[PDB]
RNA sequence: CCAGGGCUACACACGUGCUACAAUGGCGCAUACAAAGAGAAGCGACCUCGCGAGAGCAAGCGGACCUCAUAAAGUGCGUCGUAGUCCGGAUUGGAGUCUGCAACUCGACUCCAUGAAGUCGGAAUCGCUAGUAAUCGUGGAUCAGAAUGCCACGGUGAAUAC
RNA sequence: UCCUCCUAAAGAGUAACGGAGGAGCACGAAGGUUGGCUAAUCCUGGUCGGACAUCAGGAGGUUAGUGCAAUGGCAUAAGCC
């Protein structure tokens, strides 16, 4: 969307005049943004699962996919083939729309923002942030109240370092304590 | 995408209580006014105001001449 | 607490000894039985061995403790546990 | 309806629902309504946006939820870093101001379990 | 004899009380009805400032005269509409006043912020036969300061005794 | 009674009251075909979430899997959808 345009001017020109570059394919671009909602209580009750899926469809753009348990462990009393979590992956236009919605309207309401961490990065260009509560996305009616049901977002860039992806996210006017 | 299973996705025009307009595509159902936005915000402008972590020499010498 | 129209309190001997040890600069633990007297800005930079009824426990005076009194850092009733 | 800490339950009265913000009790919420001129009889249900931001700036100039949380946790932490008696009673889990601890002071130490 | 500490500690158990768990109530505002007192290194008006505890100046009174001292429930107006809630006021942080050499161990009070357990309480058990029980407030001794205890004074004032 | 390994002496076969384990079934899909896909284990980050569920990336190459014991085999996958 519009931050795709702001990327293609300002962020790519700043990363051109930040690292020594020859080609415009060296500079990283964000490939995808993945929401996870680790419900984990679907072994007990089942309607919480589809209501958490409705919350992910409300916060993100498209419908979430219910993911299944791959390895069964009795320490959380789980079984092979149970609908144990939910996830959405947005890439492209909807990813840019969700990215401008995260920056502009979501993080302002994050309830005592003392500056989110900058040591969060991966080693190959992934940021990961876990919101403690899903209210900070304004798409909820708030009149429905179910539970807390926080989620986490994982942004994946094709950057190699953490200097690379960290300065790339800092070019998107990100807070960064 | 799949053609039916997704809900509506409308471009709605929000206006921050500070005043800034934003035409964003989402799924609320109405143009909703946020209280604070990422512009004219405390931390995005620099208005965080960390506490003085002990001004006890200023406190004492303020209290007594 | 003390009213803030009266000011602070410090015993005459404690004040005079603290001023003498600040002027001559030697920073040994000076011993006192005057827990009640409040600390001052003049008093950072010196360990002081204050009374608690049995022993003189030494405290190092740092920046923060100037508003409090000297007896806050010497626990009188030593309690270790019931089992 | 949406204020910086959390929401307001929209069906209550003015000062009664304004007190539900952490950081402001009843007389200070009365001072807020005096500063906006809002009568206490109108609920938050009727309140259009003009009165809402006229409430918002006046409660912004007052101390609010998150920084007060930071201030109380930091002051307790600082007294514990000191080495005094008040921070010491904050460390152990006993009352700090001279309460009877022979039989009472149960709120500070929890249920009467063993 | 002197200085500091302890009698105030705290995994625990018991007795006696105060307070709440609420709508026969909470809160705001307005307004009415007493008695017994106490008071000189004390009792403190009226007036100035403070949200306040109070402070400053400060007449009167060894008191049926001054001073504490405004009694509150009640009565009337509106809201709250059955919720851990506009119920509860414990704990804690900050800012303060007073007294006294001194308020940290360990005083009381004011103010702001937070709002703990608690939805009438098992086995048991107590008090009470009338201006009594139950509820409401005042006062005094002790006392530099420090009552939810004690000793009094009164206001509304029942049920039952076959 | 039947199956797998060893003794069994590099074809097959070969005994003992020699050393070791399993079967008396299951499945209308766990069969046929077409199309697709590639494991186990650690490391990092991340709400509840923890040694360990979910997510993203990286090393690593079949140490994984096979409806059920063992041998042989399997990437053109015999594994998974």
Taking the C-alpha atoms of residue A15 and residue A19, their distance in angstroms, rounded to an integer, is 6
Indicate the resolution in Å: 3.5
Taking the CA of residue A86 and the C1' sugar atom of nucleotide F66, their distance in angstroms comes to: 30
Q: Please indicate whether, in this complex, the C-beta atoms of C8 and B56 are within 8 angstroms of each other.
A: no
What is the SS3 assignment for C13?
Answer: helix
Under 8 Å between Cβ of B60 and C67: yes
Domain boundaries, chain A: 1-177
Written as six digits, the tokens of D105 are: 């002071």
Mutate to test the interface with D, among A112, A133, A140, A142 (most CBs of D within 10 A): A112
Q: What is the DSSP secondary structure assignment for residue A16, as one 8-state letter? A: H
Footprint of strand F on the protein (CB under 7 A): A 34, 36-41, 43, 67-71, 73, 75-76, 78, 84-87, 89, 117, 119-124, 126-132, 148-152, 154, 156
Q: Is A67 left (phi over 0), alpha (psi -120 to 50) or beta?
A: beta
Q: Helix %, strand %, coil % for chain A, to 5? A: 30, 20, 50
Contact B34, B17 (CB under 8 A): yes
Judged by a CB distance cut-off of 8 A, whether residue B53 touches chain D is yes
Q: Are A35 and A87 in contact (CB under 8 A)?
A: yes
Query: Which chain C positions have a beta carbon within 8 Å of B55's beta carbon?
Result: none
The token pair at A135 is 């209210």
Distance, in Å, from the CA atom of D90 to the CA atom of D108, rounded to the nearest integer, reads 10
Technique used by the depositors? cryo-EM
Query: Nearest-CA residue to the C1' of E106?
Result: D98
Q: Which nucleotide is nearest to A76 (CA to C1')?
A: F53
CA distances from B8 to A63, A86, A138, B25, B28 (A): 12, 21, 16, 10, 9
Closest approach of A112 to chain D, Cα-based (Å): 5
CB pairs under 8 A between B and C: 19
Q: How many Å from the CA of D101 to C1' of E155?
A: 39
Distances, alpha carbon D8 to alpha carbons A30, D19, D22, in Å: 38, 9, 11
Can you give the three-state secondary structure of chain D, one letter per residue? Answer: CECCCCECCCCCCHHHHHCCCCCCCHHHHHHHHHHHCCCCCCCCCCCCHHHHHHHHHHHHCCCCHHHHHHHHHHHHHHHHHHCCCHHHHHHHCCCCCCCCCCCCCCCCCCCCCC
Quick one: which H or E segment has residue A100?
helix A93-101
Tokens standing for residue A26:
């060296």
For residue D100, give how far its alpha carbon lies from the nearest alpha carbon of chain A (Å): 37
State which residue of chain D sits closest to A142, comparing Cα positions.
D7
Using CA atoms of A34, A56, A118, A115 in order, give the dihedral in degrees to the nearest 10: 160
Instruction: List the CATH code of the domain at A1-177.
Output: 3.30.1440.10
- List strand E contacts in C 50-79 (CB < 7 A): 51-54, 68-69, 71-72, 76-77, 79
Which bases of strand F have any atom within 7 Å of the beta carbon of a protein residue? Answer: 40-41, 44-58
């Amino acid at each position: 969307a519009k931050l795709h345009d702001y990327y293609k001017d300002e962020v790519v020109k700043k990363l051109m005049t930040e690292f020594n570059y020859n080609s415009v394919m060296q500079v990283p671009r964000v490939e995808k943004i993945t929401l996870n909602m680790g419900v984990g209580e679907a072994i007990a009750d089942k309607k919480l699962l589809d209501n958490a899926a409705a919350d992910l469809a409300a916060i993100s753009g498209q419908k979430p996919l219910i993911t299944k348990a791959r390895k069964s462990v009795a320490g959380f009393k789980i079984r092979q083939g149970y609908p144990i979590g939910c996830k959405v992956t947005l890439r492209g236009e909807r990813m840019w729309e969700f990215f401008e919605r995260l920056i502009t309207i979501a993080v302002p309401r994050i309830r005592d923002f003392r500056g989110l961490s900058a040591k969060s990065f991966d080693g190959r260009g992934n940021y990961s942030m876990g919101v403690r509560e899903q209210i900070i996305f304004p798409e909820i009616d708030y009149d429905k109240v179910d539970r807390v049901r926080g989620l986490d977002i994982t942004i994946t860039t094709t950057a190699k370092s953490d200097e690379e992806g960290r300065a790339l996210l800092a070019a998107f006017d990100f807070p960064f304590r | 995408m799949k053609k039916d299973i997704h809900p509506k996705y409308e471009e709605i025009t929000a206006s921050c209580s500070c005043g800034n307009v934003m035409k964003i595509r989402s799924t609320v159902g109405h143009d909703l006014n946020l209280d604070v936005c990422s512009k004219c915000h405390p931390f995005f402008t620099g208005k965080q105001r960390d506490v003085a972590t002990g001004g006890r020499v200023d406190r004492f010498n303020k209290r007594f001449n | 607490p003390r009213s803030l129209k009266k000011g602070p309190f410090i015993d005459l001997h404690l004040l005079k000894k603290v001023e003498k040890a600040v002027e001559s600069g030697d920073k040994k633990p000076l011993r006192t039985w005057s827990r009640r007297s409040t600390i001052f800005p003049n008093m950072i930079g010196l360990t002081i061995a204050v009374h608690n009824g049995r022993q003189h426990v030494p405290v190092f005076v740092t920046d923060e403790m100037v508003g409090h009194k000297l007896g806050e850092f010497a626990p009188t009733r030593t309690y270790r546990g019931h089992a | 309806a949406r204020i910086a800490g959390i929401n307001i339950p929209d069906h209550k009265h003015a000062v009664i629902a304004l007190t539900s913000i952490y950081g402001v009790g009843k007389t200070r919420s009365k001072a807020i309504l005096a500063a906006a001129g809002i009568a206490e009889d109108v609920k938050i249900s009727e309140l259009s946006e003009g009165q809402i931001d006229t409430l918002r700036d006046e409660v912004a100039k007052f101390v609010v939820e998150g920084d007060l949380r930071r201030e109380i946790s930091m002051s307790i932490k600082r007294l514990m870093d000191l080495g005094c008696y008040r921070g010491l009673r904050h460390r152990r889990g006993l009352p700090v101001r001279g309460q009877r601890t022979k039989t009472n002071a149960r709120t500070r130490k929890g249920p009467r379990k063993p």
